[PDB]
Structure 1
Amino acid sequence: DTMKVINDPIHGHIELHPLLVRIIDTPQFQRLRYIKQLGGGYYVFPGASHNRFEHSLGVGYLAGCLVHALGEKQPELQISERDVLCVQIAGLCRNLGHGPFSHMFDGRFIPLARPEVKWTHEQGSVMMFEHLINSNGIKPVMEQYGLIPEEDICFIKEQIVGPLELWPYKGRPENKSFLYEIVSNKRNGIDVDKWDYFARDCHHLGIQNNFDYKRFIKFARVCEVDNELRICARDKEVGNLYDMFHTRNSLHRRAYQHKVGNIIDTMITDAFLKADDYIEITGAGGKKYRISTAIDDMEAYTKLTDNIFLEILYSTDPKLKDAREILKQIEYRNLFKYVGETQPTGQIKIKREDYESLPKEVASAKPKVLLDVKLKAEDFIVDVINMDYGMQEKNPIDHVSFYCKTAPNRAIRITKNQVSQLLPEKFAEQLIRVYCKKVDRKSLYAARQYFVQWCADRNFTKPQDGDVIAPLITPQKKEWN
């Protein structure tokens, strides 16, 4: 009937139009209350107990903020209330597709359990959105508030995942192009989703966010770039933009890719793999689904949350023992041991199809050290992490358009060399982490010897503690000394 205000620790009092309220008060949306934003990160950062629900509320709020700001500052854009509401709904709903422990599910679990499939949290979000609309009678409420369900549901979906397939969009015409740069910016990655998680994740982790989104919004404009309307930033702000991405990198280095967080996500993925044949999830029309197939039926996926973890933990079934055990070793803090980190040298790169051959390589290394144990390939875990500014090797700032103070409607480009000599020369790199499943003293020592020798063989960078953990090995490599 009427609008609701919600108090958020990050954004303060957020105003929710009744349509948005109808959307969030559904099993499909409330589901996000039971999915950790950072998953295994909670087991390293105890403040990171926040869930995808609150983050979703924040994203919808900020999307509303940005579209409103653009509207008030440039009434010649013809932004309407329909537009604002659709942008807000896309903002609210672009996290609907995340599975248990967030990045754990689409990052590790699904690629292993369903490698024949190409699955993304985006597509999950489109499917869940469809299922929410259809299961909850949302369309007549949309029509009741001035929306046109065909066009606008199309628009929302396109905001979430991109062209559902010349102007490639059917949800909105060319003159409203800029609207697709708010929720998920596929042009340069600068969107309100990032802003919310910067602020929220920082608030919960105990790290401080250094990026000011309100300032960005206040300096944002729509300008014409190559016969298309885009969101441009003031020239002055280029530095801030670089810093924004630097911040993202920082957050990944400190929190999101923390080695123990990662190994915990790994162990949970392993347990889920071992439980997949024995856990059942009741989907549409009584049908039974498993963890790995819940994504085929949205009624089932609706009921796939962090809960499973606990179901495996509290299970009495013998067939779940293995699974139940791995989780139990997480509770006792008996985790796989971190052996080290290294990087490839030069423009050398490691391709994904080769990842699987890596633990065999490590165990196949021959350190000239006397060892009482010999470890095998399956005693090693090798996590390959690609760190980049969101556009592979590309500088995302090269894909931002700027406007100057004398001519607010004339878009310009700014090159890196126009800003600072202290900026990165590369915008992508790989980090290689090696762990050992054997956790006792001797096994760990051996694992370090194998690891450093393997780094030396592949001409990788010298591990930071190399001289300490493998003093009989590091002198061999002239390039290291």
Structure 2
Amino acid sequence: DTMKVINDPIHGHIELHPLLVRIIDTPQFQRLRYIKQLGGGYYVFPGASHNRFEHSLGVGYLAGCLVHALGEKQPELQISERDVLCVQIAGLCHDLGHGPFSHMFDGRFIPLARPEVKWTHEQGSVMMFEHLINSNGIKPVMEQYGLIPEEDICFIKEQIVGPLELWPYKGRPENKSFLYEIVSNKRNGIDVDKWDYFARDCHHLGIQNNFDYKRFIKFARVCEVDNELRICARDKEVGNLYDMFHTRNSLHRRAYQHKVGNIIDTMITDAFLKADDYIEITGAGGKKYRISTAIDDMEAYTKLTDNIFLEILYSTDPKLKDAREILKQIEYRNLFKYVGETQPTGQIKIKREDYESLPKEVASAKPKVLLDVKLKAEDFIVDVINMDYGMQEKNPIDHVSFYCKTAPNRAIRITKNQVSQLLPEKFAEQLIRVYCKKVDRKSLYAARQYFVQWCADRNFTKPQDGDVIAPLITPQKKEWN
């Protein structure tokens, strides 16, 4: 009935409309309190204790800030309170679909557990959102505050996942197209979701950031672009936009793809796979699901959080011994050892299906060196990481519209050459990391020899420490030295 104020360390005091409060105070939303934003990253950065819940509040907040700012600067847009609330709800609910340890679940576990299924947190979010609305009688409340549930639920889902299918959207018309650019921007990835996690992750990781998404909001405008009304940035902000993506890449390099964070994520995933058939999760009508099938039933999925990790760890079931033992090894910090990193060379890329064959490939290499131990495919992990600017090969800034101060209503396009010659020439790459399950000194030395030999055999890039870890092997390849 009245607004609530929430104090957030990143954003300070956030005002929440009563309808938003109703949505937040539900089991489906509060679930996000028990899911770590950075998953295994917490085990490397102790500051990163934050969960999806607080991130979601921030995203809803910033979504409101942006839509409000646009409305105040351009009354002609006819932005309504109903529009503002719908955008905030989408911002709040965009991460509802995340599973235990966030990206590990959708990124690592589900692809291995259920390769046939094509699943993402986005799809999960839409399903959970529907479940949230229907389970908690939210629709009546939406009507009370002027929302029209048929159109607006559609609109909210479309903001989260894109067209459920010309204008392909049904929730709002072309004149309100800019509303779809705020929470999850499918056009170029510039959205408030990134702005919140940049600031929040940095706050917790202990990586400094004085920058303003606030600045961006202040300079945002709506212009006509190809018969749609779209969000346009001021021209001079283009450098800041390139930097936003640079920041994202740096955060991935330093933190999200930290070699040990990833290995912990990998180990947890392995534990989950071993546990899958023995954990049972109760769904709608008392039906039982597995970790990998809870995504099919939202009532079951509601109860799938980071807790599962502890349920396995603390279990006594003999059937869970293999899974439990992996988790125990994580606790003792008996983790697999990082051997090295390389990149695929020139046009060659690694296909997703071929990830599985890779450990065998490394083991198959014959390094021209004496070896005390012989290592097996099963002793290796090979982690293939796709680093990009959020749009695969594409430059997202080529998909941004800008305006100039002398003609604020006229959208223009800006190419990379018009900005700096020091920008990336490519917007995607792969990293290949190799680890060894055998942690002893002799094994690790051997693993380094196999690894560097495999790099040479494949014409991959010379590992940075190649000359130190494998002095005998590196001479072989002339390109390297």
Measured against the shorter chain, the TM-score band is over 0.9
Measured after TM superposition, the shift of residue 143 of structure 1 is 0.3
Task: Please give the per-residue CA displacement for 1:425-466, whole angstroms capped at 9, x wherever unaligned.
Answer: 111111000001111111111100000000011111110111
Task: Please give the per-residue CA displacement for 1:100-121, whole angstroms capped at 9, x wherever unaligned.
Answer: 0000100000001111100000
1:199 aligns with 2:199: yes
Instruction: Give TM-score scaled by structure 1 length.
Output: 0.99
Q: Equivalents in 2 of 1:287, 1:461: separation in Å?
A: 51
Greater than 6 Å deviation, 4+ residue runs: none
Q: Equivalents in 2 of 1:364, 1:300: separation in Å?
A: 43
**What is the SS of the residue equivalent to 2:22?**
helix
Measured after TM superposition, the shift of residue 358 of structure 1 is 1.1
Measured after TM superposition, the shift of residue 211 of structure 1 is 3.7
Does structure 2 conserve the Cα–Cα contact (< 8 Å) formed by 1:211 and 1:244? no
Q: Greater CA deviation, 57-66 or 274-283?
A: 274-283
Q: Equivalents in 1 of 2:49, 2:12: separation in Å?
A: 19
Q: Equivalents in 1 of 2:209, 2:151: separation in Å?
A: 37
**What is the SS of the residue equivalent to 1:304?**
coil
Q: Equivalents in 2 of 1:387, 1:163: separation in Å?
A: 26
Does structure 2 conserve the Cα–Cα contact (< 8 Å) formed by 1:210 and 1:247? no
Q: Equivalents in 1 of 2:314, 2:359: separation in Å?
A: 32
Measured after TM superposition, the shift of residue 233 of structure 1 is 0.4
Does structure 2 conserve the Cα–Cα contact (< 8 Å) formed by 1:436 and 1:444? yes
Q: Greater CA deviation, 189-198 or 373-382?
A: 373-382
Does structure 2 conserve the Cα–Cα contact (< 8 Å) formed by 1:211 and 1:247? no
Measured after TM superposition, the shift of residue 289 of structure 1 is 1.1
Does structure 2 conserve the Cα–Cα contact (< 8 Å) formed by 1:449 and 1:470? yes
Pairing 1:68-107 to 2, within 5 Å after superposition: 68-107=68-107
Measured after TM superposition, the shift of residue 286 of structure 1 is 1.0
Does structure 2 conserve the Cα–Cα contact (< 8 Å) formed by 1:211 and 1:240? no
Measured after TM superposition, the shift of residue 252 of structure 1 is 0.3
Measured after TM superposition, the shift of residue 212 of structure 1 is 1.6
Q: Equivalents in 2 of 1:284, 1:239: separation in Å?
A: 50
Measured after TM superposition, the shift of residue 345 of structure 1 is 1.8
Q: Greater CA deviation, 127-136 or 283-292?
A: 283-292
Q: Equivalents in 2 of 1:53, 1:30: separation in Å?
A: 7
Q: Greater CA deviation, 346-355 or 9-18?
A: 346-355
Which residue is 1:266 aligned to? 266
Which residue is 2:415 aligned to? 415
% of aligned pairs identical? 100
Measured after TM superposition, the shift of residue 346 of structure 1 is 1.6
Q: Equivalents in 2 of 1:360, 1:461: separation in Å?
A: 19
**What is the SS of the residue equivalent to 2:37?**
coil
> How many residues end up aligned between the 2 structures?
481
Measured after TM superposition, the shift of residue 264 of structure 1 is 0.2
Q: Greater CA deviation, 341-350 or 466-475?
A: 341-350
Task: Please give the per-residue CA displacement for 1:111-169, whole angstroms capped at 9, x wherever unaligned.
Answer: 01111100000000000000000000000000000000000000000000001111100
Which residue is 1:286 aligned to? 286
Q: Greater CA deviation, 57-66 or 278-287?
A: 278-287
Segments of 5+ residues of structure 1 without an aligned counterpart are none
Does structure 2 conserve the Cα–Cα contact (< 8 Å) formed by 1:280 and 1:289? yes
Task: Please give the per-residue CA displacement for 1:217-268, whole angstroms capped at 9, x wherever unaligned.
Answer: 0000000111111100000111000000000000000000000000000000
**What is the SS of the residue equivalent to 1:478?**
coil
Segments of 5+ residues of structure 2 without an aligned counterpart are none
Measured after TM superposition, the shift of residue 65 of structure 1 is 0.3
Q: Equivalents in 1 of 2:121, 2:49: separation in Å?
A: 20
Instruction: Give TM-score scaled by structure 2 length.
Output: 0.99
Task: Please give the per-residue CA displacement for 1:303-356, whole angstroms capped at 9, x wherever unaligned.
Answer: 000000000111011111111100000000000110000011222222212222
Q: Equivalents in 1 of 2:133, 2:165: separation in Å?
A: 21
**What is the SS of the residue equivalent to 2:260?**
helix
Measured after TM superposition, the shift of residue 2 of structure 1 is 1.2
Q: Greater CA deviation, 202-211 or 281-290?
A: 202-211
Task: Please give the per-residue CA displacement for 1:397-442, whole angstroms capped at 9, x wherever unaligned.
Answer: 0000110011001111111101111111111111000001111111
Q: Equivalents in 1 of 2:469, 2:381: separation in Å?
A: 18
Measured after TM superposition, the shift of residue 283 of structure 1 is 0.9
Task: Please give the per-residue CA displacement for 1:63-116, whole angstroms capped at 9, x wherever unaligned.
Answer: 000000000000000100000000000000000000000001000000011111
Measured after TM superposition, the shift of residue 369 of structure 1 is 1.0
Q: Greater CA deviation, 342-351 or 44-53?
A: 342-351
**What is the SS of the residue equivalent to 1:189?**
coil
Measured after TM superposition, the shift of residue 209 of structure 1 is 2.6
Which residue is 2:462 aligned to? 462
Measured after TM superposition, the shift of residue 210 of structure 1 is 5.4
Q: Equivalents in 2 of 1:431, 1:211: separation in Å?
A: 28
Q: Equivalents in 2 of 1:353, 1:50: separation in Å?
A: 33
